[PDB]
Structure formats: structure tokens, C-alpha cells
């Protein structure tokens, strides 16, 4: 029974440095970051295989996770990010020809049963590009959703200083049609956090630590059994 | 295209292969599977529960 | 032109062998043991509760010993258990904490990982100094790894989210065989008990049977309606079991070319992770999104028992090779042992 | 085995009618739900329309919304895509897409290059 | 008398009537806890820690009663240091435990970040285990000074106070007074203030409507857990207070009946915390509907 | 609390 000792101790050992990293792992937010090609997520928060990203915001560490080396197949693969504090969906709000795709995709990690309980944190980008895209007037909305044409601005709307109306109503047209989406199912258990930027923002990190704050504040409370 | 049709032409090949196979039948293979379970049946503790003195996790 | 006439071809083929498949299609496993005396009711009971992972576990393999398993979870952990025990004989941190998949050498002298690296990382559990280190890595795959077993200390194949299966050597770190064919990804790969032929379980609804030392798929089993997650080799080889998402169970035999039985029932609607037999063959144990295990009556097609202990999703299964017990993982943190 | 095998396409005037049809075997086509897809020349796949399984859940891309009309008959195993007041811009080859798992919301990776659940497609030239 | 008489049968009723539904109630919810919920949380494992002191402090409601009617203690020495014990220990441990509830929820919300690594079920039964071991500190006290003293012809548990007898009575009362009422309710209210002023920008439910609909549920159970706390507690406490500095008559049927009313509404918060943490609790209503359905 | 004075 001394080698059954040694074998104990040396599990306890063990025991030891699993609840230590686990401490260390536990205090680590880990996000998945996902989008298109044209999307622009690499430089969300400008800081082979799977590539991680790693930030930290007011002593909060965030491991986000950009899925690269896989293919265009993702219902397997996305089945790992489970347990993942927030989904960082980015979207090229300028190109209105993937938007739907970009739609379908949300519609997917958002009725997924394995990603039904994951908050999305939406990161409508490349405002810029819409903008322009919209003063322009060349493409229409309307030739892509011809629920646009129907679509009034949100009163609850908050237009940036010195916006256009029409880029404003484009810009929140595209939040809505993500919303309705979120909405349409997982009432309580994860919530759609959308949020306008451009390639040049270096607020985003500030934008991810609040809306994490806010899933991490809902997630104690089912916790707590207040919710 | 030209990947397409290679794949396809691929596809044909691995068809062929598969298409010229010695496929015995049903009740030949059932009688063989069969045979393995009872012949293997007092040897598996799963299906005939083990003593707990033969047992390592009792 | 020519691609229409290679594919009418290939429609042509099609129907030839499902010709063929009907042809040798007599009669059916149920009639065959409709006389044998069903198994009763299949009540295993928890005797050993692994915790220690502190994240989702999402792959287990047993050692060829039947005592030591490795689990896989994405707490970055490798951890090596004495089962009997339950003692953490090796807690191996890995590089990429997206772990799919883990296997035990039939020497019990490596271990293996992989996942959304797509690297096939070899550990070496019999260092000199005592301590695992990074003996191999097997870079070359451009998909996820999702399967991964040793053939023996030298040789392991690994199936892959690239579509395509690898036959490594891991002192050179090459790929000495590529197993291409499946249209999906390949969720997973099952060893013949003589180690000359493979089955891979696909995202395609279908499984194909691989040689080894050929390099070629000899048989495509195809009757899965969902992707294939699990793939489990029946104990003689000349038959394996399928778990797939369209809540089914299916047993293939390789001479026969064709689906057996299929393990299904109407209240069941979730997918199969992971699916093992029993020493007999007799059992057919699967991991299900129900977040429970269903013992099948594999030659009868009912349900013999039900391994319900886990709160969330089981991921993985593994009976050992005397039989003794059955280990499950599940994505609430836990590994039990069952008998 | 998952076979989808469409028909239906073929040349037509812009502003035409075509009825496009998938005969689905090898799994039970009322656990799925189905989706129709594009592939325009020089373009990606692109989603068009899904139906639930049931046939209640209905929905349409924003570029055929009102000109396409999904419906699914579970009994015969068979989706169907009423395409009229067909446009150059449809022009494409139509792939009847199943979802990958049964009884699922979710309908993952459809528009991908090498979908398993997906047919051999139906060419559409909509062509003066 | 028969007016004394119905009196005393109202009050052996009263404490019947809470020792029943305070017994029934946390053996309730430790049963569910140990057969279906399993402990595998911090907040499971506060709830049942509450449940065990609130079971434990009711326990001592037969003594009591039994006491007030036979107006005597039957029990002998070891049964008084017993129950008077019980009765200060779980008390305290009730009352931190609710204490420790506010600032677990108070963590969980104003602080998320940090919760994850300070609400862990280990560190939950640290805590547990440093509330029962400080509630030792004055129970191991009361163990030791309580006594049975003759008094007018029939016996009485009472504290045996050290020299001079009345100040250290009133230095004890004072507090508990303090650390069972005082400082428990300064904490309960200023940690679940803070979790609802927190909690009046996190985006709980989308939609507007439901999302305050949400928020009134939770601030109405901080609400109904706080003035339970105040009611139930605050007039024994006020009563003892009023006992101690000012002179009643002391024999009074109406300042008896009072006493004990009082006395009752102190077991009712023992009684009434079953159903305010697990009725209320959300993880304990969708293990309910699951296991009926 | 407050049964015994
Ligand atoms: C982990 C926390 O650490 C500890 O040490 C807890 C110990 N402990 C307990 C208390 C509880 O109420 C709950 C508990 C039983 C689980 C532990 C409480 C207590 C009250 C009365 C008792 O009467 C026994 C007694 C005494 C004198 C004469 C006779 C008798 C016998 C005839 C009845 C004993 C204990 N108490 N007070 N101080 N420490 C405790």
C-alpha cells in the first residue's frame, strides 16, 4: 500500500493543479468570434488552426477565439463553443447581397441546441461602408429586403450626430432584421447585443466587457435562482 | 468545370470498385453475428453481471 | 456531356449495387434471432464518478490494460485516470484547449489529442525525466480533428473535419496514407480487431470501410439519414455499428454490404454521440443528446437499459477490452463507470 | 442513402413561370426541414427559401420574396418552388438543400460548397 | 382563569401552527435539495444551510410552548442548555445565512466578473462552514450559562449571567440585538439596494414589457424578503428592548400575549424562508416543472 | 428568540 499512497498523492497532487488552473481558466472570458470573410472580424478589437485573441478590459481577461483552418462546414465544429461566455458575430453591414447569408448563419447559432443558451454579442460593421454605400444611392435595400420599404426608424433609435436619416434607417433596418430574429426564440436564456462600428472604433473591447458584464450579471442570476 | 468532373470521375471509379464486390448474404452474416454473441456470451460481464469479488469496481 | 454520362454512370452504379444489396437481402436480423431469449432488463450502475475536469469533456478512450482510460476535455486537460481508483495518474495540459478527440495506445506508453488545432498531438506517458512532454505533433490536417486512434506505437490514424482520413507515422510526423472519399466531415474512425481495415463515420449519412495498407474505400455503407457522429466496430470485424443525428442506431455488416438493424424509437428524436459494443457484441451501448445512454439489445433492436446519470450531453463512451465496464464522458464534467 | 434529385429547370423568358421540383428519398422528408439554393454564375451558393416540416414555418430571401412560392408534400416526398415572374438575375443552378439533423430550428452549413444533404441541382436560365 | 386559559391555547396554537408549517416547510426543501437538486451550486448550498438552522430553531418551538403552558421547564438542565442553545445558535446561523444570501446575490450581480470565481460551491461551504463556527462563539456561551433556576415555586430556563447579572443581560441583549437585527439588516438592505440599482440597466428580457416585468419580479421578492425580515424580527427585537429599558408590568395578559406573538413572528421568518428561497427561487420552480411533466 | 428572556 505505499505504491497506493504514492498513486493518491500524486493524484491529490494533480487534484491541486487542476483547481488552481481551473481558478486561473475561470476568471477567462472565452469568446467565439465569427463572420464572413468580408466582415472585417479581425479587426474588431485590433489587439494555423484556431486563432485566439487575447485582451483584457478594466483587469478582465478575454480569450476570443477566431476559427480559421476549418472548412465552410460549421454544425460540428461550432458544437465545441458551448460553453463560450458570448458568440461575437460580425457582419459587413455594407454588403447587402450577404446579409441574408449572414442572417441565415445567426438564425442557425441562434436556434442551435448547443448554442441556444449563448448570448451573441452583433457587431454590425462597417458602418462607414454603409453609409457611403447608402448616400451613394446605387445599391437599394429594397432589391435585397423589400420589407425596407415598409420599415420606419425605431423611436427607441439613436442616431449618431451629423447621420443622414436614410443611413440611419438602413443601419437599424439591418439591426432589426437580426433582432426579429433573436427575438423569435431563446426569450431569457441569451440575449442579441447589436452594435454599429466601423474599421476604425476602438471602443469595441469597451462595447464586448459591457454586454459580457451584462451576460455574466444574467447568467449568476439563473444562478441565484433570481432569474 | 475540371474538379468536378474529376471528382465525378473519381466517384465512378470507387463505384466500379464497390459495384464488383463478393456481398454474402443476410442470413449467412446474421448467423455468423449470432453465433459470435452466444459463443462470447458468458465472457462479457456487461450482458452477464460479474460477481462483485470478480468485479474491479464493485 | 462527360460530366451527365459520369453521373448517369454513377446513378447506374447506384442502383447496381443496391440491386445487389436487395439480392443478398433474404431475410432480415429479426427473423434470424427472432428465437433467442432477449436480454431482460440492463441495469448498470454507476460504480465510479471520474471528476476532475473542469470543462466539458468531449472525448474518452479506454487502455488496453481495462484500468487506465484518458479523457479528453477543453479545460486544456489531458487527464489519465486509474479507473479503479479513480486516481489522476497524468494531468497533461494541452496547447489548444479545443480537444475533439483523445486515444490511449494499446502499449499504454502514449497517449493522443487533437481538435480544433488540427493537429494530432502525440504525449508520451513514459518519459524518462517523468514528466509528459509533447512527443509528436502531426500537423497536415486542414479540418478539425475529430478521431483518433493508435494502430500501435508508431502508427496512428486520424480521422478529420477536412473530409478525409490520415494514416500517421509518428516518428517521421508524415502521412503515410490518405483516406479520401467522404463528401462530409469525418465525426469518427473504429479500428478492426485486426487492425488491416477501418470504418469512418461521416457527416454524408454515410460509412465507409478503408483499408489500411491499400489506402482505398472498400465499402460505402450508406441508410443513415443524418451525419454519422459514432462508429463502433462489432468485436468479430466483420460487422460495426453506426450513431448518427437522425436519432439511429444502425448496424452494418461489411461482408453482407448492407444495414442490419437499426436502433431507434419514437420517443427518441436526439442524435447519437458516441456508440460502443460489449465484449459479445450483444450490447450495443449509445451516447445520446438526451443527455442519457440507451442500451441496445443489438441482435433484438430494444432498448436493453438506460444509463441515465448525466446532466448534460454525452459526448463519449468506451467499453473496455475484457468488458468489464463501460466509461462515460459526458459535456456535464464528468466521467462514470458503469457495469 | 440521402438522395435529392431536382427537376424542373430549363430555359425561360424573363417574366416566366417554372415549377421546380426535388424527389427526396433515403430519409423521412417530413423530419426536415428543406431548403432551396442558388448558385449563379460566378457566385456563391445563396440561400433562397425554407419551409419547416411541418410547412407552416415558411421563409423567403428578400430576392424572390412574393415571385417564389416553397411547398413541400410529405406524403409524396417531394418540395416543390413555384419561380414566377422569373428575372435574369435567377438565373442559376437550384440545389434542394436538406437540413443536416431532423427535429432542428437550426439549418447549418446548406449554402456550403460540399453539402452532403444536398442534390445534384436543376440548371434555371432565365434568358430572352 | 378561562380567559388565561384561552389565552394560552391561542398562544399554544400560534406556536403549533409555526413550529408545523416551519418544520414542514425546511424539511421540504432540504429533502428536495438532497434527493433533486444535489448541491452542485453556491446558492443550493446557502438555501440548504438556511433550511437546516430555520429546521433547527423551530425545533425548539415545542420546548417553548410546552414551557408557556405547564409555566414551568420540565425538561431539566441538560434539555435547557440544549434548546436555549439551539435556540441563540440557529437563530444566528438563520440570520447569517440570510445575510450571506443578499451578499451572495449582491456579488452575483454588481460584481459578475469576480462572482465567478468568489460564488463557487467550495467557497459556498467555506463560508457556510465560517458561519456555523461563528455562530459557535456565542452558542458555546449560551451552552455554558444556561441554566435551571427555581423561581416563585416552578423552575425556569434562564442564562446565568456573571456578576453583576443585569448588565451582561442587557450587554447580551444589546447584542443581538445588534448583530442579529442591526447589522443583518444593513447588510441585506444595502446589498440587495445595490443589486437592484444594478440590476435597472441589465438587459434582462427583450422586449421592454417583459423585461420590466422581470425586474418587478425580482425587486418584488427583494422587497417581500426584507420586510419579512423587518417584521418578523423587528418586534421581538423592539420587544425585548421595551422589556429591558422600560418598566411594564410584566405579568400582563395582553403583554404575555404580546411576548409570545412576537416570539412567533421571529419562528415565522424561519417558517416563511422555505417559501421565499425555494417557491421563489427559479432553479427549484424548473426542477418542479420538470419533474411533474 | 425571546422565549427565555
Ligand atoms: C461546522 C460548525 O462547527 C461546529 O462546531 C458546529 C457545532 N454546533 C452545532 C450546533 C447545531 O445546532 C447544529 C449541529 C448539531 C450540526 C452542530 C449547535 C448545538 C446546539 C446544542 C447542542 O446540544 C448538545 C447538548 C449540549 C449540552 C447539553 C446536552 C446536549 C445534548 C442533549 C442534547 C449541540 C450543538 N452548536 N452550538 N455551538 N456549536 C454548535
Known sequence: SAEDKAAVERSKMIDRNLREDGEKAAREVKLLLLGADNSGKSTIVKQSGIFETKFQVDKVNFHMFDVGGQRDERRKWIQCFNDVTAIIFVVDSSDYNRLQEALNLFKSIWNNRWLRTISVILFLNKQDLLAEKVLAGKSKIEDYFPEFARYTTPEDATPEPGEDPRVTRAKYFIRDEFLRISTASGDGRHYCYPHFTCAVDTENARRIFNDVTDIIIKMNLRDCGLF | NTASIAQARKLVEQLKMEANIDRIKVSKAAADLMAYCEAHAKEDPLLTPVPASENPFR | ?339 | QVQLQESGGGLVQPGGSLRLSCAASGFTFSNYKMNWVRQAPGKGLEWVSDISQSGASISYTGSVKGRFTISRDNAKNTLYLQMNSLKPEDTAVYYCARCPAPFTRDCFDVTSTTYAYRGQGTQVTVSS | SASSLALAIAITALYSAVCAVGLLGNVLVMFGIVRYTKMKTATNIYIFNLALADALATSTLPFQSAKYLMETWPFGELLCKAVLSIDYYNMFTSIFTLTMMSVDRYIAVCHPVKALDFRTPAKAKLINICIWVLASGVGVPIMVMAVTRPRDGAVVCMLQFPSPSWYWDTVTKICVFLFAFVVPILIITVCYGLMLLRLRSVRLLSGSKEKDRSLRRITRMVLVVVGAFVVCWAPIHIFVIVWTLVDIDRRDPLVVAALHLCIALGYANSSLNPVLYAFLDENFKRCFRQLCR | YXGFX
Open chain 3, 1 to 339: 456531356s462527360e460530366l451527365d454520362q459520369l453521373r448517369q454512370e454513377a446513378e447506374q452504379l447506384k442502383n447496381q449495387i443496391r440491386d445487389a444489396r436487395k439480392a443478398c437481402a433474404d431475410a432480415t436480423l429479426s427473423q434470424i434471432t427472432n428465437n433467442i431469449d432477449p436480454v431482460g432488463r440492463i441495469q448498470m450502475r454507476t460504480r465510479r464518478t471520474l471528476r476532475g475536469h473542469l470543462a466539458k469533456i468531449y472525448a474518452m478512450h479506454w487502455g488496453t490494460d481495462s484500468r487506465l482510460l484518458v479523457s479528453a476535455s477543453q479545460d486544456g486537460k489531458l487527464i489519465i485516470w486509474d479507473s479503479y481508483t479513480t486516481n489522476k495518474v497524468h494531468a497533461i495540459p494541452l496547447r489548444s484547449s479545443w480537444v475533439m478527440t483523445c486515444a490511449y495506445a494499446p502499449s499504454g506508453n502514449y497517449v493522443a489529442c487533437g481538435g480544433l488545432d488540427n493537429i494530432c498531438s502525440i504525449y508520451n506517458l513514459k518519459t524518462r525525466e517523468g514528466n509528459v512532454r509533447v512527443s509528436r505533433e502531426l500537423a497536415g490536417h486542414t479540418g478539425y480533428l475529430s478521431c483518433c486512434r493508435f494502430l500501435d506505437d508508431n502508427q496512428i490514424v486520424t480521422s478529420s473535419g477536412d473530409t478525409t482520413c490520415a494514416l500517421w507515422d509518428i516518428e517521421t510526423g508524415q502521412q503515410t496514407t490518405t483516406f479520401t472519399g467522404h463528401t462530409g466531415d469525418v465525426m469518427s474512425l473504429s479500428l478492426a480487431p485486426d487492425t488491416r481495415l477501418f470504418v469512418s463515420g461521416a457527416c454524408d449519412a454515410s460509412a465507409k470501410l478503408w483499408d489500411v495498407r491499400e489506402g482505398m474505400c472498400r465499402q460505402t455503407f450508406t441508410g443513415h439519414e443524418s451525419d454519422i457522429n459514432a462508429i463502433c466496430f462489432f468485436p468479430n470485424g466483420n460487422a460495426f455499428a453506426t450513431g448518427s443525428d437522425d436519432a439511429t442506431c444502425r448496424l452494418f455488416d461489411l461482408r453482407a454490404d448492407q444495414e442490419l438493424m437499426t436502433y431507434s424509437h419514437d420517443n427518441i428524436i436526439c442524435g447519437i454521440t458516441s456508440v460502443s459494443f460489449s465484449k459479445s457484441g450483444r450490447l450495443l451501448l449509445a451516447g445520446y443528446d438526451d443527455f442519457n445512454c440507451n442500451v441496445w439489445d443489438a441482435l433484438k433492436a430494444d432498448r436493453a437499459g438506460v444509463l441515465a446519470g448525466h446532466d448534460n450531453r454525452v459526448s463519449c463512451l468506451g467499453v473496455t477490452d475484457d468488458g468489464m465496464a463501460v466509461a462515460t464522458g459526458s459535456w456535464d464534467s464528468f466521467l462514470k463507470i458503469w457495469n
